[PDB]
Structure 1
Amino acid sequence: PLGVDSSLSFESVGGLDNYINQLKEMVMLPLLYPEIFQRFNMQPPRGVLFHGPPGTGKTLMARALAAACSSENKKVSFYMRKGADCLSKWVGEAERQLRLLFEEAKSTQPSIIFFDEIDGLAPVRSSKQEQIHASIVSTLLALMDGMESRGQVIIIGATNRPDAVDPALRRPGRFDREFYFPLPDRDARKKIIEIHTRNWDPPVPEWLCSMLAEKSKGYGGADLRALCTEAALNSIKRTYPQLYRSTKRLQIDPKTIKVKVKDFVMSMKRMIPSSERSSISPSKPLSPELKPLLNEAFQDIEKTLQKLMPVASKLNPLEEVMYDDPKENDFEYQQRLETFETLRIYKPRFLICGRKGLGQTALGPAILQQYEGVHVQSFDMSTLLQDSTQSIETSIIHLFLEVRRHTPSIIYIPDIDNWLNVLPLTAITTFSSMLERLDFSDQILFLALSSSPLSELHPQLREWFSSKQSVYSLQYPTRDSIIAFFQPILELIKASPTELPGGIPRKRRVLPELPLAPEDRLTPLKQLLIDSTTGFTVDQLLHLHSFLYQIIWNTKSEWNRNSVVDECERAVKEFMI
């Protein structure tokens, strides 16, 4: 059956190395080196506040910390407190459980305590309720620190939000660490999936990683293990159909090890993402047959993206200090590199103008997918009108405040032709103010999408975007790209009966026992598809593509060729209306 483990070698949360060194410098040093705390007479406190996606290192870095320190040294004890679990309606009974737990935590000397659900442990301190909201918060203040020199004990905090509570709970000088979980995307995703998949006596192929790791976006350690279990059970029922209706119990052979990539892709048909349980995010790669239709400008988007903003990230200070320099006295040499790759910028924004039905609003999610690791959100007016409890301008100042409270991050607005007709001049001039409230010298991108083409626009954008390179206009694709797009189906006309299942028999499987345990017109069709379709829009090409898919689906079984051209050609004739 099932079972939980108490040993973790960072094998389901693995990849947060700089976090690991940051916590190692907090928890290892005070009793590893007990001398330099008097050589300098130094304090440094301990305590980390987790925030980010839950289960992406919430329970997983809980096991990574208890397993980390248990694998670190002997002896050491560990404590798990998950929200309100020692409380009452009394103050003086709730708390007497709490500080009996505190005094026994102080009695056991090598000891850490996990505290999760810090909102449930201590909410915001308001006096418009009963005074236990002030009482347990103040008594946790004095009983964690302030009055209480805790000595050798370590207090761990975890939330989903870094600001779900009043900042008195983060007194600066006791809880000076806060860890954000960035949900690793591609490479530590491939690391975390391959450190999972080696727990099987069949080693997995490594062409499927980072193939499956780039398919899997928005997942924790546990649900990627759920992908492991669902592909596993797909191998189970796949290998054996006789898994049903057993009152007389059965026995098995132990040689039931067969693995498919079909198991994984059926798991992808049968999955659901964790972030996409309640969200809608445009995390959509560009369509692979549409790459003949948009790679040619997509390259210009990613190159001019790279030029108008470097996407350069921070290296590890471990290897940086593994390097050494000779000169260390020169703050002028410091302000040199502090000017380097920092003062090279000015106000990241970009605009897309082009016709409707011409590759719109898919390239947006595509260039969202062409690089990751950055923080990003968009001013979707669905996400702006989603609350009415406050003003929408209060929501504007809020969301501008949180994208201010990040890394160099990404801001997007779709459909600005329809937008600015949606909200009044309150929110308009609000936003135009908030455009200028921040500096040029920070790196926040401002992607902008319009479904209307150029030189016809209200000038609100124009005074905002008077740079000649702050915009790009779109054109029709070339005929060679067109015939590149219709190429594969133009040989799928010829490969019906046994290449495709239009004429492939599907046969039955027998049950196991599992014993008892007690050609020539192709070119006039070519001049029908080309040169009579005078460079139209790509959605119309999607119409035709769907239509011919219906044609070849209905005409899926045919031998003795050149008999199935009449259906598609008259469909083109009808399409020209």
Structure 2
Amino acid sequence: SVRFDSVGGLSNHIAALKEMVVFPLLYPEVFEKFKIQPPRGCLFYGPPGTGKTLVARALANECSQGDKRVAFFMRKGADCLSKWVGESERQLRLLFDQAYQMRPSIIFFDQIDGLAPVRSSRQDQIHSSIVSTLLALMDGLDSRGEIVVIGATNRLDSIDPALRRPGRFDREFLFSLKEARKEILKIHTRDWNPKPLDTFLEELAENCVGYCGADIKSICAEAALCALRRRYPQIYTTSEKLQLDLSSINISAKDFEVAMQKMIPSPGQALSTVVKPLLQNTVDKILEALQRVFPHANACYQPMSFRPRILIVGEPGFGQGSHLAPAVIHALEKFTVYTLDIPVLFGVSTTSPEETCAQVIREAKRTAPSIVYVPHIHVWWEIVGPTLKATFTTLLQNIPSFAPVLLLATSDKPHSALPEEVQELFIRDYGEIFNVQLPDKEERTKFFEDLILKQAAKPERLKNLLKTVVKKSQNYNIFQLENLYAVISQCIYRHRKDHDKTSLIQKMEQEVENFSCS
């Protein structure tokens, strides 16, 4: 039922899997020209929840539909278990021949852990002969095509070590657990009478942090199930269905949100729904400046730079590391990010801090371009020992000059107050230091539109009130603004069940005048 249309996000995995597995089986005479000798053993491995067997079934559909030029047999290495001496043994030679009498073919082996476990002194002589003669079945009945052994498992070490030898089972395909999620939401709701809004589904996928595929459909089914709970609360404690129209179970804005809150669900995090219209301008500005310094976000017509470096400096309480920098990291996605802070350096024992400080830089060198994050450099410099500072400096210096790896750091004290070793590390004469500024008047004006007023009247003079709140908030930092918002929004809850107005507005207007934060 799936022909590469119920798969979301896997734009690059498909190209690799088809080119090195199916195409050599789809076009075997081509590789006779150069003698590539493609491997005869392939695997699907990764964390659970990646949907490994469905890909094999899709390959079966692709190969079977047509002229039957390449085939596929579906097999499981966990239901192929026979409690007899050698009866499950014939399954592979017949299968490696049944798929060979009608070759080419791809044979899937789900959970080979049971059919071919680790033969040992505790395992049955049955399974001992099974595994021995079984590896004899595969390494002997291969090496000329056109059978490519594809298997799946949850753990890589759950395989008999004699299987993974030269000239035997070799290849491994990494399946991992957000760009896939838009495609997933598009696909899995292909036939829905209450078709949700595209922004509705995008918010759904945004709020489904940590889910991998199956639970993505599970939440949708659960949302429908609780929709018929909420629209029809009388389903409990009622007689047989007498009059129920099964069309008012339509999913609206609040249905999935009440559905999401009924189960438990990196230094990059976008702003909240309340914070976005306050710092979005500054995030865009810093992104633009970074574009200017860092062009990656002999021969010409190729981007090049000289040691990408940048420092965020702002007065404490300006949210330069509390809200800005993780947001910038989130905005500059599709690049590897690697932090270096105290709980990641001292948070693991059985290792010297020097032992991990080299691994991050080495592996970020491997995957250039990469991002290294060092928050609160003004305090991180005074916690490490004398050797760590020197090791950090030498590791940073050993980078190539034209390597497009960016150093991102944030600070609280002004640049002129830092230790001198930091000072002769940034080039303020260049574009390497960015300043954070207080929000302007429009942002503060638009920060209070929702509560004043789009929900208070939900079942004048307050406008003067409104401007007074702004008339005092010219020079308050982010934390004071947000705490003020929370304290005002509390009173709105305080009189939910008071239809009579002019008494709640009195208490709001007297609390705002009473709010002293000098």
Taking structure 2 as the reference length, what is the TM-score of the superposition? Answer: 0.78
Q: Secondary structure at the match of 1:369?
A: helix
Task: Determine if the alignment matches structure 1 residue 153 to structure 2 residue 143.
Answer: no
1:193 pairs with 185, 197, 201, which one?
Answer: 185
**Partner residue of 1:448?**
409
8 Å contact 1:354–1:454 — kept in the other structure?
no
Structure 2 residue aligned with 1:259, among 225, 236, 251?
Answer: 251
2:3 match: secondary structure? coil
What percent identity do the matched residue pairs reach? 40
Which of the numbers 437, 449, 469 marks the counterpart of 1:475? 437
Is 1:24 matched with 2:14? no
The alpha-carbon distance between structure 1 residues 345 and 113, as it changes in their structure 2 partners (threshold 3 A), is farther
Conserved? CA contact 1:51–1:160, under 8 Å: yes
Tell me by how many angstroms 1:465 deviates: 2.3
Residue 21 and residue 409 in structure 1: after superposition, are their counterparts in 2 closer, same or farther (change >3 A)?
same
Which of 208, 215, 219 does residue 227 from structure 1 map onto?
219
In structure 1, the partner of 2:37 is 43
- Which runs of 5 or more structure 1 residues have no equivalent in the other structure? 1-6, 125-129, 274-280, 313-334, 505-518
| 1:465 to 1:576, Cα distance in 2 relative to 1, 3 A | closer
What amino acid sits opposite 1:347 in the alignment?
R
CA distance in 2, matches of 1:307, 1:231: 46
2:282 is aligned to 297
Worse-matched range after superposition: 370-379 or 542-551:
370-379
Distance 1:396 1:576, change over 3 A: closer
Superposed, 1:167-566 pairs within 5 Å as 179-181=173-175, 185-186=178-179, 188-245=180-237, 255-256=246-247, 258-273=250-265, 281-310=266-295, 336=299, 340-342=301-303, 344-360=304-320, 361-406=322-367, 408-467=369-428, 468-491=430-453, 496=456, 499-500=457-458, 504=459, 519-520=460-461, 522-523=463-464, 526-527=467-468, 529-530=469-470, 532-533=472-473, 535-556=475-496, 557=498, 559=500, 561=502, 564-565=505-506
- Measure, in 1, the Cα distance between the counterparts of 2:441 and 2:51: 50
CA RMSD of aligned residues (A): 4.6
Q: Does structure 2 retain, via aligned residues, the 8 Å contact 1:551–1:568?
A: no
Q: 2:126 corresponds to which residue?
A: none
Letter in 1 for 2:447: F
Paired with 1:352 and 1:429, the residues of 2 have a C-alpha distance of 23
* Aligned position for 1:106: 96
Q: CA deviation at 1:268?
A: 3.1
Alignment partner of 1:13 is 2:4: no
Q: Over residues 335-382 of structure 1, what are the superposed CA-to-partner deviations in whole Å (9 max), with x where a residue is unaligned?
A: 84xx6435x133334321212222232222322332433333322432
Give distance in 1, aligned partners of 2:275 and 2:154: 38
Task: For 1:243, give the aligned amino acid.
Answer: I
Query: Match of 1:514?
Result: none
- d(CA) in 2 for partners of 1:448 and 1:56? 35
Task: Kindly indicate whether the alpha-carbon contact (under 8 Å) linking 1:106 and 1:150 is maintained by their aligned counterparts in 2.
Answer: no
Alignment check: 8 A CA contact 2:106 2:150 kept: yes
Does the 8 Å contact 2:42/2:173 carry over to 1?
Answer: yes
Secondary structure in 2 matching 1:345: coil
C-alpha distance after superposition, 1:469-516 (max 9, x if no partner) = 222122223344333323544446xx73xx33xxx3xxxxxxxxxxxx
Distance 1:546 1:190, change over 3 A: same
1:250 to 1:164, Cα distance in 2 relative to 1, 3 A: same
Partner Cα separation in structure 2 for residue 424 and residue 85 of structure 1 = 58
Instruction: Evaluate the alpha carbon distance shift between residue 305 and residue 159 of structure 1 in structure 2; reply closer, same or farther with a 3 A threshold.
Output: farther
Greater displacement, 170-179 / 397-406: 170-179
| Pair 1:122–1:375, CA change in 2 (3 A) | farther
**Whole-Å Cα distance in 2 between the matches of residues 147 and 40 of structure 1?**
23
Distance 2:509 2:75 in 1: 67
SS at match of 1:455: helix
TM-score, scaled to structure 1: 0.71
Give CA deviations for 1:517-562 in whole Å, capped at 9, x if unaligned: xx457547734x3454550211112222222122333245364648
Structure 1 counterpart SS, 2:306: coil
What is the CA–CA distance in structure 1 between the aligned matches of 2:491 and 2:2, rounded to whole Å? 56
- Corresponding position of 2:510: 569
Q: 2:157 and 2:186 mapped to 1: Cα distance?
A: 34
- In 1, the alpha carbon distance for the partners of 2:256 and 2:394 equals 49
Counterpart of 1:106 in structure 2: which amino acid? F
Deviation track 1:118-138 (CA, whole Å, cap 9, x = no partner) reads: 9999999xxxxx9xxxx9999
After superposition, give the CA deviation of every residue in 1:210-263 in whole Å (9 maximum; x if it has no partner).
4434444543221211121122112221232233357x7658868345232322
Q: Does structure 2 retain, via aligned residues, the 8 Å contact 1:10–1:64? A: yes
* Superposed displacement of residue 81, structure 1: 5.2
**What is the rounded CA distance, in whole Å, between the counterparts of 1:160 and 1:538 in structure 2?**
47
* Other-structure match for 1:327: none
Taking structure 1 as reference, are residues 216 and 46 closer, same or farther at Cα in structure 2, changes over 3 Å only? Answer: farther
| 1:196 CA drift (Å) | 0.8
In the superposition, relative to structure 1, how do residues 159 and 241 fare at CA in structure 2: closer, same or farther (>3 Å)? same
